[PDB]
């Protein structure tokens, strides 16, 4: 819905898990629109700073991931429509990754950039 | 362009190499005079 | 030092200054006419 779309260009941040791009206000008020139940960054700014990225390259307005080859290449076909990031710089701490793995969610990096 | 700078009648080959401006030349109106020889031209002082 | 200009339509004269906008004092007419020179002129009557 419109609740996922960022409201302005300032302080745009991409998620470290699903590369969801939202403003800091939307992360503070809604958390993650895909996997907040696995992260629980709603109601905590420090969790957002630890689970979101300040450096991202490229945006994708994924509207219909069920019939998108881009979603196949970016592995976001099973998610919800929204604004996604192509390249994400950052990484979750080991505690969050281990907690996700204990819940059966292995953390695949969204850093698909060609580093030299 | 360079081709347009060379191809014309105002270019380098005709306009500058073939027919060019020259020093030591004067241009003024002619008026008749029957009191000088056929190989004599009466030029003004300010030209000379 | 000031230059006297004739104020166009006004036909009156006034002083002018360097870097002074060109305006008459009577009606602000923009066109000024410089006065005739003070040095002598001599004409051969030919």
């Amino acid at each position: 819905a419109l609740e996922t779309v960022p409201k302005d260009l300032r302080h745009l941040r991409a998620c470290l898990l699903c590369s969801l791009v939202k403003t800091i206000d939307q992360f503070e008020y809604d958390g993650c629109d895909n996997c907040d139940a696995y992260l629980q960054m709603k109601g905590n700014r420090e969790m957002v700073y630890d689970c979101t990225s300040s450096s991202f390259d490229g945006i994708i307005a994924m509207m219909s991931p069920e019939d998108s080859w881009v979603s196949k290449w970016q592995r976001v076909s099973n998610f919800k429509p929204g604004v996604y990031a192509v390249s994400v710089t950052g990484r979750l701490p080991q505690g969050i990754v281990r907690e996700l793995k204990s819940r059966g969610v292995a953390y695949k990096s969204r850093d698909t950039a060609i580093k030299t | 362009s360079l081709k347009q700078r060379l191809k014309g009648k105002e270019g380098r080959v005709r306009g500058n190499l073939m027919g060019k401006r020259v020093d030591f030349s004067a241009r003024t109106v002619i008026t008749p005079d029957p009191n000088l020889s056929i190989d004599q031209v009466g030029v003004p002082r300010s030209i000379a | 030092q000031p230059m006297i200009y004739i104020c166009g339509e006004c036909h009156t004269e006034n002083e002018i200054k360097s870097r002074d906008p060109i305006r008459c004092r009577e009606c602000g007419y923009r066109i000024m006419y410089k006065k005739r020179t003070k040095r002598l002129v001599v004409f051969d009557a030919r």
Partner: protein, 434 residues
């Protein structure tokens, strides 16, 4: 230009009376550029709606209410090119339209009706751009310009009887080029309305005067019909070049290349048409006692021997004015023009000329002799690197045009459109005929 064909350049037959046959630029633009005749007038055009209403008032059948069987036995009628319908009786319709044009009831005088008689057509043109000329109207082999019209026309400014009143009287009317194809035009009334071995005896219009077929510059030629046509064309080219008083207020105008004459004269041998070009009020030339004689050999091949004493008496001694305009530019502080007397120690790049002729504001006071490469406008533009030493603003001054000399006539100082100071200097140089 530069076309090898001749049909667009030739003097077509329909150029009679509308455009001068002699005047034209004789360079590579012969016939292309033309000069309008004297009485010729370009119709400014009006709306065709009153004409359509008048046609619908009479028995004209529109295209959307006709059978395609009764079309060929009647005349197709056009307005401004568009076909408006049919009419059964072309006569008494052209008569009615002309009767309204000789009275200015509905149809304007500029509008033209043309009845094609060989092919059943009648076209009415109300366009803006048609070229017409007034002609007399010949009812019977009698002119409609009676003696009473002349009596009321001589006493102008008293009866307020103008040319428009004569147009309203149904005596003269404007005939355009289309209508000239369907008019029988009398040249002069003293010859083409008296009974003889009859030529046509069916005249409709009469030419006012044949001298009105010429232009403005071909009208100042005395006896132009006795000359050869190329000579008339060349005189038409030269007539727009003769020195003279081009305008009455030339002392106010800051014109560039103003050529005026000391003692212009009206021609002793003149035409009637010069009274209407006002050539006797702003003439160009002097009546001279010429002699056509072979002599010492200086009037050999298109040259003339002049009289030195006559020239010393003011014969053709003209005066040539040339204006110089210059303004300063307030810019982004990198270059700043300003009118001032430049100094050798202060200004840089100052050309070697006399700068003491200038006044304190960098301009010449009127009445000062100047010659070639003499400064007339002292203007200096600042240099951005004066700090980036001891050498400051550079000279940007307009000199007097080289190989020219004369006295400065008058100088005007004002502001331009942009509000910057702006000066014009008109320099006067008399030109004795040599």
């Amino acid at each position: 230009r530069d076309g090898k064909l001749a049909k667009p350049r030739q003097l077509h037959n329909t150029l009679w009376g509308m455009v001068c046959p002699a005047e034209t630029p004789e360079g590579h633009a012969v016939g292309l550029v033309k000069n309008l005749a004297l009485m010729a007038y370009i119709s400014v055009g009006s709306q065709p709606s009153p004409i359509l209403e008048f046609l619908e008032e009479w028995s004209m059948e529109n295209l959307e209410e006709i059978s395609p069987a009764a079309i060929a036995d009647a005349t197709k009628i056009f307005v401004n090119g568009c076909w408006v319908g049919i009419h059964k009786d072309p006569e008494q319709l052209m008569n009615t339209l002309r009767k309204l044009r000789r009275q200015m009831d509905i149809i304007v005088s500029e509008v033209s009706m043309i009845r094609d008689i060989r092919e059943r057509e009648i076209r009415i043109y109300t366009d803006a751009g048609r070229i017409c000329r007034p002609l007399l109207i010949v009812e019977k082999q009698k002119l409609l310009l009676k003696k009473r019209h002349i009596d009321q026309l001589k006493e102008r400014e008293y009866n307020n009887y103008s040319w428009q009143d004569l147009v309203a009287s149904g005596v003269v009317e404007y005939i355009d080029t289309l209508e000239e194809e369907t008019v029988m035009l009398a040249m002069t009334p003293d010859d083409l309305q008296e009974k003889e071995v009859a030529y046509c005896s069916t005249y409709t219009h009469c030419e006012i005067h044949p001298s009105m077929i010429l232009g403005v510059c071909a009208s100042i030629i005395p006896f132009p019909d006795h000359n050869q046509s190329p000579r008339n064309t060349y005189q038409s080219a030269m007539g727009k070049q003769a020195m003279g008083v081009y305008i009455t207020n030339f002392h106010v105008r800051m014109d560039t290349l103003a050529h005026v004459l000391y003692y212009p004269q009206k021609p002793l041998v003149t035409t009637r048409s010069m009274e209407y070009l006002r050539f006797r009020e702003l003439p160009a030339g002097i009546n001279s006692i010429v002699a056509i004689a072979s002599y010492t050999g200086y009037n050999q091949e298109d040259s003339v021997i002049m009289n030195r004493s006559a020239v010393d008496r003011g014969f053709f001694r003209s005066v040539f004015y040339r204006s110089y305009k210059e303004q300063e530019s307030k810019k982004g502080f990198d270059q700043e023009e300003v009118f001032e007397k430049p100094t050798r120690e202060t200004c840089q790049g100052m050309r070697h000329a006399i700068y003491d002729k200038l006044d304190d504001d960098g301009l010449i006071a009127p009445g000062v002799r100047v010659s070639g490469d003499d400064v007339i406008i002292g203007k200096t533009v600042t240099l951005p690197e004066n700090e980036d030493r001891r050498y400051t603003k550079r000279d940007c001054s307009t000199f007097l045009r080289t190989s020219e000399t004369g006295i400065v006539d008058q100088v005007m100082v004002t502001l331009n459109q942009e509000g910057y100071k702006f000066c014009k200097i008109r320099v006067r140089s008399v030109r004795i005929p040599q």
